[PDB]
């Protein structure tokens, strides 16, 4: 029934934050798919108050796919918002700055 949220395993760890107005949750499964398989996602943006967050996470099979997408989607802006992404570094915060 109730299961804990599946985070990426040993070696691949992908957090996608700061998605543009056409990127979003049912579409996260859509554009990342030919570079490798989906396992679980949800966007925690607290929808009723809109405090800066827009913070994400996702599960990819095995580490030969970590480093091959982690740099093709870094810094290329889509629209009025920019995408910044990295290997799982020590989790201390859930705000941009």
72-to-3, 5, 15, 34, 84 alpha-carbon distances in Å: 32, 27, 14, 13, 11
- Answer for the pair 63, 14: CB distance below 8 angstroms, yes or no: no
- Among 65, 28, 61, which Cα is nearest to 45's? 28
Report the relative pairing of strands 81-82 and 77-78 from DSSP bridges.
antiparallel
Please, which contacts does 72-81 make with residues 24 or more away whose CB atoms are closer than 8 Å? 72/35, 78/20, 78/22, 78/23, 79/20, 79/21, 79/22, 80/20, 81/18, 81/19, 81/20, 81/21
Enumerate domains of the chain plus CATH numbers.
1-97 (3.30.70.330)
């Amino acid at each position: 029934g109730s299961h804990m949220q599946k985070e990426g395993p040993e070696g691949a760890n992908l957090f996608i934050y700061h998605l543009p107005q056409e990127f979003g949750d049912q579409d996260i499964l859509q554009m990342f798919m030919p570079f490798g398989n989906v396992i679980s996602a949800k966007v925690f943006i607290d929808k009723q108050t809109n405090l800066s967050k827009c913070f994400g996470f996702v599960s990819y099979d095995n580490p030969v796919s970590a480093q091959a997408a982690i740099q093709a989607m870094n810094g290329f802006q889509i629209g009025m918002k920019r995408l910044k992404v990295q290997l799982k570094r020590s989790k201390n915060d859930s705000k941009p700055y």
